[PDB]
C-alpha cells in the first residue's frame, strides 16, 4: 500500500483545511485542542509519568484529556498518509540526553548503534498524544531525530492547524496510548540526524 506524502505547503494546507471543516468538533472539544497546543509538553509529560492513568490529575485536566480523546471519534484520515515529527535526544532514553550528539553537531555513531539495538524492528507505546506535521516544518525539522509515520486509511488522526495557537506547523494530532512499529533507522546524508520510519498501529 502507498502513503500520501505532501511536498507543497499550500497543497497540504488545502487538504488539511478540507478535513477540518468536516469534523464538526464541539465548542468544548475545540477549547481542549487549542489549550493542548499551548501546553502539550506538560500534558504529555504527566501522561508519561503516570503511564496513562489520569485519576490523580486536577479535575480540569481530566476533563481536557477526556475531550481530546472524544474528539478522535470525529477525526479520521480518509487515506493512507505519511506524517512527520521532530524529537530531541531524550526521546530515545535518559542515556542519550548527553551522548547522542558529538561536539561538531554530528550524531555519535556508537550512540546511534545503541539506539538501533534498542528500537529497530520493535513496537513502541507512547502514553502522550503524538503531535505530527503534514510536512517537515522549520519549527521542528532541525531536531536531531526525524520520524516518518505511516498512518493507514481510517486511523484516528486530526488536522488541528486551523485552531492551533502557533503558526507554520501543519499539525496532525494522533491519539494517546498509540503503538507504532519502528521499521527502519538510518543516519541522514549529512550525518546530523537520525531518520526513523515507523508504521502506526492502534491504541489497544
Ligand atoms: N515535534 C513535532 O514534530 C511537532 C509537530 C507539530 C506540532 N508540534 C507542537 O509542538 C508542541 C509539542 O512539542 P513536542 O511534540 O516536542 O511535545 P512532546 O510532549 O511530544 O515532547 C516534549 C519533549 O519530550 C521528548 N519526548 C517525546 N516523547 C518522549 C518519551 N516517550 N520519553 C522521553 N522524551 C520524550 C520530545 O522529543 C521533546 O523534546 C505543541 O505546541 C505542538 O502543537 C510539534
Amino acid at each position: 500500500n502507498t502513503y500520501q506524502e505532501f511536498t507543497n505547503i499550500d497543497q497540504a494546507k488545502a487538504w488539511g483545511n478540507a478535513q477540518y471543516k468536516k469534523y464538526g468538533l464541539s465548542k468544548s472539544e475545540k477549547e481542549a485542542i487549542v489549550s493542548y497546543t499551548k501546553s502539550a509538553s506538560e500534558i504529555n509529560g504527566k501522561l508519561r509519568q503516570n503511564k496513562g492513568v489520569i485519576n490523580g490529575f486536577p479535575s480540569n485536566l481530566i476533563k481536557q484529556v477526556e475531550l481530546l480523546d472524544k474528539s478522535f471519534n470525529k477525526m479520521k484520515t480518509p487515506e493512507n498518509i505519511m506524517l512527520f515529527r521532530g524529537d530531541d535526544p531524550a526521546y530515545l532514553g535518559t542515556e542519550f540526553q548527553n551522548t547522542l550528539l558529538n561536539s561538531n553537531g554530528t550524531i555519535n555513531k556508537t550512540a546511534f548503534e545503541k539506539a538501533k539495538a534498542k528500537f529497530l524492528n520493535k513496537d513502541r507505546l507512547e502514553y502522550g498524544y503524538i503531535s505530527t506535521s503534514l510536512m517537515n516544518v522549520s519549527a521542528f525539522a532541525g531536531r536531531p531525530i526525524i520520524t516518518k509515520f505511516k498512518v493507514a486509511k481510517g486511523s484516528k488522526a486530526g488536522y488541528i492547524d486551523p485552531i492551533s495557537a502557533f503558526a507554520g506547523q501543519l499539525e496532525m494530532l494522533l491519539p494517546r496510548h498509540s503503538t507504532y512499529h519502528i521499521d527502519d533507522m538510518r543516519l541522514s546524508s549529512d550525518g546530523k540526524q537520525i531518520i526513523i520510519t515507523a508504521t502506526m498501529m492502534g491504541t489497544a
Side-chain angles (χ1 to χ4, degrees):
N1 227 168
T2 65
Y3 292 78
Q4 163 61 19
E5 177 161 341
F6 287 99
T7 53
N8 178 279
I9 292 172
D10 294 309
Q11 290 202 318
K13 285 183 152 185
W15 180 87
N17 287 341
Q19 294 308 127
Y20 179 83
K21 191 98 185 267
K22 297 179 163 259
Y23 294 155
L25 299 164
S26 73
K27 176 185 81 205
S28 57
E29 281 171 337
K30 286 185 200 195
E31 290 168 1
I33 289 164
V34 173
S35 170
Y36 170 83
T37 65
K38 300 179 190 189
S39 61
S41 191
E42 169 66 20
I43 291 168
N44 294 331
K46 283 177 79 68
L47 291 164
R48 286 192 276 275
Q49 274 174 3
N50 294 102
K51 303 169 114 297
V53 183
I54 70 175
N55 296 36
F57 292 4
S59 57
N60 271 1
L61 184 55
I62 293 171
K63 172 148 184 57
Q64 177 176 17
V65 166
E66 288 180 345
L67 286 163
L68 290 171
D69 294 346
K70 199 179 168 78
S71 294
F72 286 105
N73 297 343
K74 293 166 175 170
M75 302 194 297
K76 318 281 207 278
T77 177
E79 61 183 355
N80 290 354
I81 189 160
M82 302 296 292
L83 301 174
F84 298 87
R85 196 184 146 79
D87 277 284
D88 288 332
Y91 165 79
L92 299 170
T94 48
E95 69 264 36
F96 294 94
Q97 191 61 267
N98 299 325
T99 61
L100 187 62
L101 290 179
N102 290 320
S103 313
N104 62 10
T106 63
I107 298 284
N108 184 277
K109 291 220 84 213
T110 294
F112 169 61
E113 294 298 335
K114 181 67 67 155
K116 264 204 296 197
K118 185 167 179 195
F119 294 117
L120 182 62
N121 205 22
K122 304 187 180 195
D123 280 355
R124 176 156 174 167
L125 168 73
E126 180 52 51
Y127 291 108
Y129 301 89
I130 306 173
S131 294
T132 73
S133 299
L134 291 181
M135 294 178 64
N136 247 297
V137 300
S138 61
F140 310 105
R143 293 186 168 183
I145 302 151
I146 303 296
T147 300
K148 308 187 282 156
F149 288 114
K150 302 204 280 285
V151 180
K153 177 173 180 254
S155 296
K156 284 167 163 195
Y159 188 74
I160 60 164
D161 180 297
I163 58 173
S164 180
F166 298 101
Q169 297 185 355
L170 300 170
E171 174 165 8
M172 289 278 284
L173 192 61
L174 306 177
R176 70 184 176 108
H177 202 268
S178 291
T179 288
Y180 49 95
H181 193 266
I182 289 165
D183 306 310
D184 313 277
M185 297 176 70
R186 69 175 173 78
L187 298 166
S188 63
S189 70
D190 60 19
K192 293 206 230 172
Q193 302 176 304
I194 295 167
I195 309 307
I196 299 178
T197 298
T199 298
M200 191 59 54
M201 319 290 165
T203 52

